[PDB]
Curated annotation (Swiss-Prot), chains A, B:
PANTHER family: SULFATE TRANSPORTER (PTHR11814)
Extracellular compartment residues: 92-93, 196-234, 341-351, 410-446
GO cellular component, as recorded: apical plasma membrane; brush border membrane; membrane; plasma membrane; sperm midpiece
Family designation: Belongs to the SLC26A/SulP transporter (TC 2.A.53) family.
The UniProt record lists the keyword Plastid: no
Organism placement in taxonomy: Eukaryota, Metazoa, Chordata, Craniata, Vertebrata
Subunit field text: Interacts with CFTR, SLC26A6 and NHERF1. Interacts with PDZK1. Interacts (via PDZ-binding motif) with NHERF4 (via the third PDZ domain); interaction leads to decreased expression of SLC26A3 on the cell membrane resulting in its reduced exchanger activity.
Protein name as annotated: Chloride anion exchanger
Described purpose of this protein according to its UniProt entry: Mediates chloride-bicarbonate exchange with a chloride bicarbonate stoichiometry of 2:1 in the intestinal epithelia. Plays a role in the chloride and bicarbonate homeostasis during sperm epididymal maturation and capacitation.
Chief location of this protein within or outside the cell: membrane
Reaction equations catalysed: hydrogencarbonate(in) + 2 chloride(out) = hydrogencarbonate(out) + 2 chloride(in)
Cytoplasmic-side positions: 1-70, 115-118, 174, 256-319, 373-388, 468-678
GO biological process, one term: monoatomic ion transport
Domain STAS: 502-697
Length: 702, 702
């Protein structure tokens, strides 16, 4: 009910003098350098454990309650992984057994080095499209059938190895916090545009048409044109099969989600549809009757290791950087969801290390890159997976297909694989609804979403990302560019001060002005700040100083020529007459008017706000005190320290007292480093609050 | 000296109900669209006078006091113009007579459309190098001695016309505020690196050696190799002539600065040295005796209008954007200084329009792009120039040489022109001391300087600028990435609250925590802010909620089987001892532990902090209230609003009250737009200050 206070009036210097301050030590780099080197016995044990996490989670396995659960989940995820690997290999434009290699090797590495316990490691569509684009370019710029397929495989393997190297290097240097530089709106726009890319790139398998290997910019418009200019040659059986598979798979997917609790396990529609399709095609000999395109024969076995090509490294460095960034971001975002739901910790540097090692091994043995998909991870998590033993069981399923029973997938058509790939794009395609929500909530975020979408659609998936990050950085300057400044007044005859234009019956003490800037002051808004302050007080102090210096010159002259009395009472001007004329100052002597006024020579004080003798006129002002509220100024830079110092000096040379209030102890400490305080500008201008400053002023004048 | 206050405790809602606000009207773009095109009489003249500024300053011209001064200034500046123009043409690699054209046309245009009264319009060293690079690129990409020269002249004219067009478009669209995007630290680094490029360029003329037209990246290193791989073919006479001219000018240059007042006029050393040099080279026949290179014969007269090449426009679009921006930035900076010294207003949009028109016309008549040189402008200003009339006298001097006296410059060597261009580099080279100064003052600005320098040396002048602007934007995120958060306490038994670790004898009311974050909270630091708050309070509220929900379920199990009576007065626990049973919820039903607790079924209150029956265990907490100080938080974004809601809701389910203090009225109005307030989070959580909230809590818990 009551707010009652009685204390003294405090400036920052006065407060510090009366209250003992705790001694603090400023840590030194050489001393700082020393902590890591020690390597005491106990420290060594923990650093090794961090690098090889399996040696910590495996001996604590709850066999009785976690073993059966992992086996059921492993069998379901391995089946899904085989099919997705075949389809994504189709997306990278090579034979489809390399997708099996890409589903096998990185999961085996992640079993030993990873920190997440719920994700499924392998390829996903956006990264496969990016790898295919990078591979087209390297081939074109390689200074001078099946030979063509031998060149594409080699280039894909080299790109994978280089991306893995970059990831591992970033993980060793402890830079795992680079994920903070991508906001949510950027990622939403990027993934919606990439879903449109993936949709367009599947049309050549639903129709069975032949399309060249276009490259960016405007890659998507070229592909669309190539397809419809030859629309008459569409194979009909492929189209009908694809439509049936899409239709049916989409319906069963909705049923699962709606009745989630009722069903013991989710229904496996993708496996069922594949069995029937393969069987009908083989049974009815679709390949020789309707001329459909099938998977064909695959060589049963792994390939021997190869060596990466330095020529390829030179031509694809920029693309590899983009691939590493996208892979890490997606995997980290997906892993974060599960860690929060089950409460366990997650280490980003170790994730970078593990993904890099996995990618390096896959490329050496002929695979392509990938981190994790949200759809396969949801399948693993939904069917009860507890740990990564589910991933090992899925990899064993993949191995059985690679070595023993790969011949059963020979009569399957590419239309069915394309239809499955298209059925997993509903989530990313519903993100278009974000446009209406962001428009109403926040307009800068709506702008980021739209710009990202257009850059990604018009430019490629590699350049669009860089352009989008740059534009997202520019919006931060857009936010703080023209801050909304104001004048404050007293409301209620207490210690409360608010905006002068919002309430009835406000009060302003005579001769005092209070100004507030609600933002940091850096190189991009110091001119705006100066212009607003000059508009707030009503005049320019440098003009007043020049006009005062000028009038002083005229007084000094008349005095020496015998027309001015120079009596203690005032300037008598014995010869009433005078002539007004401006002593023209040349270009090399006009700087004298900007100097501080010294009147020690004349025996009486010269009021500058009262009439001067012999018809000499200067503009008059009613202000004697100015208060600056800096409660919302977070930081300053060299540009702003320079601009601020010149503003204050000008006010002090015309006799106006200045004050700064509302700042913490850390702010003032930094100011000392910039060499801001000197004879003219002292540290005695800082006070704790606005009310403290007003009370001090009233006592001084009175 | 007493601060005495007696008032009521206020929450934001309560304050607003006792003080009547003022009528406020929301901004409406419909009116803005409508009102701007008033098309009134008084408004229409104002626009015409704005566009054609000469109609305003010429009528009111002080003939007695300014006419003699302008003529003296004009003659001095026209002489320097002829010499610099011939020199800059060598940098562009075209015949010398074209630099004379570039010094004549834009000044004539700037007479009518400009707003500045003290600058010299024409070509400068850095811009000339940028154009030369652009021409080389264009020639190397066109579809397949004098003829080669013919090709270079045409390409230079086309680039100039296009750059002028871009400047004009920006001016009409009112985008004159683009100068704010480049900081003083970036500009200093860029100019120092640029000067080094110019020094290297001169070497071929000083030694008289032949060098191929290299292109970026790493263009500077290539030229150096070419020069010293043939240093034994160096002409000695040329080198000796250059060294002497450089030695003499640098000295007389200092005297002007040392004895500035004792001189009625500055000594014209550049003109004197040229007359003596040419006169001696002519009488001694150096060309046929020592084999020195000379300017040679020039055709007397102008060229006919020529049309631009569309193909050239297509190959140089990126280059043209760089030229336009740099030209405007340099000119605006130089003109800003004199506007301040002489107190007159400058329009940014009109300057873009005037410069754009001058560059277009010059290109049509075969000249190259330019803006203003500080060294030439200093000459016009220091010799008494008053207005743009001085700019016109200089152009008439240029006309005389083109039309009538060009032939007296035939016997002059290129070594002397190169030596003059080098004697103006001293101011730009000295900018090297900024490294130590900025290192002492502020390290982010030192980093900006060094990165700009390195990017400009290695990548050249066009790409280095873009890379530097991007890095300068990234430093802003570097500044606010890891904010220094803290816990506050009461010091002195009054309304003052400071850092808990800085003073002796501080006080903390029990069950209360006060947390402060001194920065805005956007997508880049929201994750960091959450971790720090959880470290400050000492626990995680979601873990506490899950364990409570968990103990409640166990209690319910026993109650249903009759082991626990749960009568009104107290739990009865008829079965004395029990054995710990665990439910082990599966993946699909686990989220149930995150809900709000409802205990309505049990007729009595349950105190979580008090001990529970049958050895059930839940972690205990001491905190009952939390205060968040948001005075230095300037803005929020969609990512931080979502993040903050989650935290506030979690604290409220475990029964901890939350308060937000220190915000302004606008801040609160923005929050409503993001749909922040609902039935659990209410607007009654906002208070005016920290002391207001602490007093409210103590009364309540009383």
């Amino acid at each position: 009910n009551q707010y009652i206070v009685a204390r003294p009036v405090y400036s920052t210097n006065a407060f510090e003098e009366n209250h003992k301050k705790t001694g603090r030590h400023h840590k030194t780099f050489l001393d700082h350098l020393k902590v890591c080197c020690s390597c005491s016995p106990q420290k060594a044990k923990r650093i090794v454990l961090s690098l090889f996490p399996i040696a910590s989670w495996l001996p604590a396995y709850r066999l009785k309650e976690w073993l059966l659960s992992d086996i059921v989940s492993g069998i379901s995820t391995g089946i899904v992984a085989v099919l997705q690997g075949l389809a994504f290999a189709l997306l990278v434009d090579i034979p489809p057994v390399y997708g099996l290699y890409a589903s096998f090797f990185p999961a085996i590495i992640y079993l030993f080095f990873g920190t997440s316990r719920h994700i499924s490691v392998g390829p996903f569509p956006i990264l496969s499209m990016m790898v295919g684009l990078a591979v087209s370019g390297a081939v074109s710029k390689a200074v001078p059938l099946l030979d063509d397929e031998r060149v594409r495989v080699a280039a894909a393997a080299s790109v994978t190895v280089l991306s893995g190297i970059i990831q591992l290097a970033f993980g060793i240097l402890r830079i795992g916090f680079v994920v903070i530089y991508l906001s949510e709106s950027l990622i939403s726009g990027f993934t919606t545009a990439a879903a449109v890319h993936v949709l367009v790139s599947q049309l050549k398998f639903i129709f069975q048409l032949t399309v060249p290997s276009h490259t960016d910019p405007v890659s998507i418009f070229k592909v669309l044109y190539s397809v419809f200019s030859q629309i008459e040659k569409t194979n009909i059986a492929d189209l009908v099969t694809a439509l049936i598979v899409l239709l049916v798979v989409s319906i069963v997917k909705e049923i699962n989600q709606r009745f989630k609790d009722k069903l013991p396990v989710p229904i496996p529609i993708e496996f069922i549809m594949t069995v029937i399709a393969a069987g009908v095609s083989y049974g009815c000999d679709f390949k020789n009757r309707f001329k459909v395109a099938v998977v064909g024969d695959m060589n049963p076995g792994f390939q021997p290791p190869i060596t990466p090509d330095v020529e390829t490294f030179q031509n694809t460095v920029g693309d590899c950087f983009g691939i590493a960034m996208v892979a890490f971001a997606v995997a980290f975002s997906v892993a974060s969801v599960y860690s929060l739901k089950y409460d366990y910790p997650l280490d980003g540097n170790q994730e970078l290390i593990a993904l890099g090692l996995g990618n390096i091994v896959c490329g050496v043995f002929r695979g392509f890159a990938g981190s994790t998909a949200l759809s396969r991870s949801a399948v693993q998590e939904s069917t009860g997976g507890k740990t990564q033993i589910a991933g090992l069981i899925g990899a064993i399923i993949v191995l059985i297909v690679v070595l023993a029973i790969g011949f059963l997938l020979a009569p399957l058509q590419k239309s069915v694989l394309a239809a499955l790939a298209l059925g997993n794009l509903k989530g990313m395609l519903m993100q278009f609804a974000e446009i209406g929500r962001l428009w109403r909530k926040d307009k800068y975020d709506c702008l980021i979403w739209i710009m990202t979408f257009i850059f990604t659609i018009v430019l490629g998936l590699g350049l669009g990302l860089a352009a989008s990050v740059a534009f997202q950085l520019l919006t931060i300057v857009f936010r703080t560019q023209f801050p909304k400044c104001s004048t404050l007044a007293n409301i209620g005859r207490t210690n409360i001060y608010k905006n002068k234009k919002d309430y009835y019956d406000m009060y302003e003490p005579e001769g005092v002005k209070i100004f507030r800037c609600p933002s940091p002051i850096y190189f991009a808004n110091i001119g705006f700040f100066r212009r607003k302050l000059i508009d707030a007080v009503g005049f320019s102090p440098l003009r007043i100083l020049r006009k005062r210096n000028k009038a002083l010159r005229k007084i000094r002259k008349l005095q020496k020529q015998g027309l001015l009395q120079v009596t203690p009472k005032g300037f008598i001007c014995t010869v009433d007459t005078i002539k007004d004329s401006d002593e023209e100052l040349d270009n090399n002597q006009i700087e004298v008017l900007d100097q501080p006024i010294n009147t020690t020579d004349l025996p009486f004080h010269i009021d500058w706000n009262d009439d001067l003798p012999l018809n000499i006129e200067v503009p008059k002002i009613s202000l004697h005190s100015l208060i600056l509220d800096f409660s919302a100024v977070s930081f300053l830079d060299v540009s702003s320290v320079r601009g601020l110092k010149s503003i204050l000096q000008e006010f002090i040379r015309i006799k106006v007292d200045v004050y700064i209030v509302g700042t913490d102890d850390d702010f003032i400490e930094k100011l000392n480093r910039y060499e801001f305080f000197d004879g003219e500008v002292k540290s005695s201008i800082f006070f704790l609050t606005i009310h403290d400053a007003v009370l001090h002023i009233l006592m001084k004048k009175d």
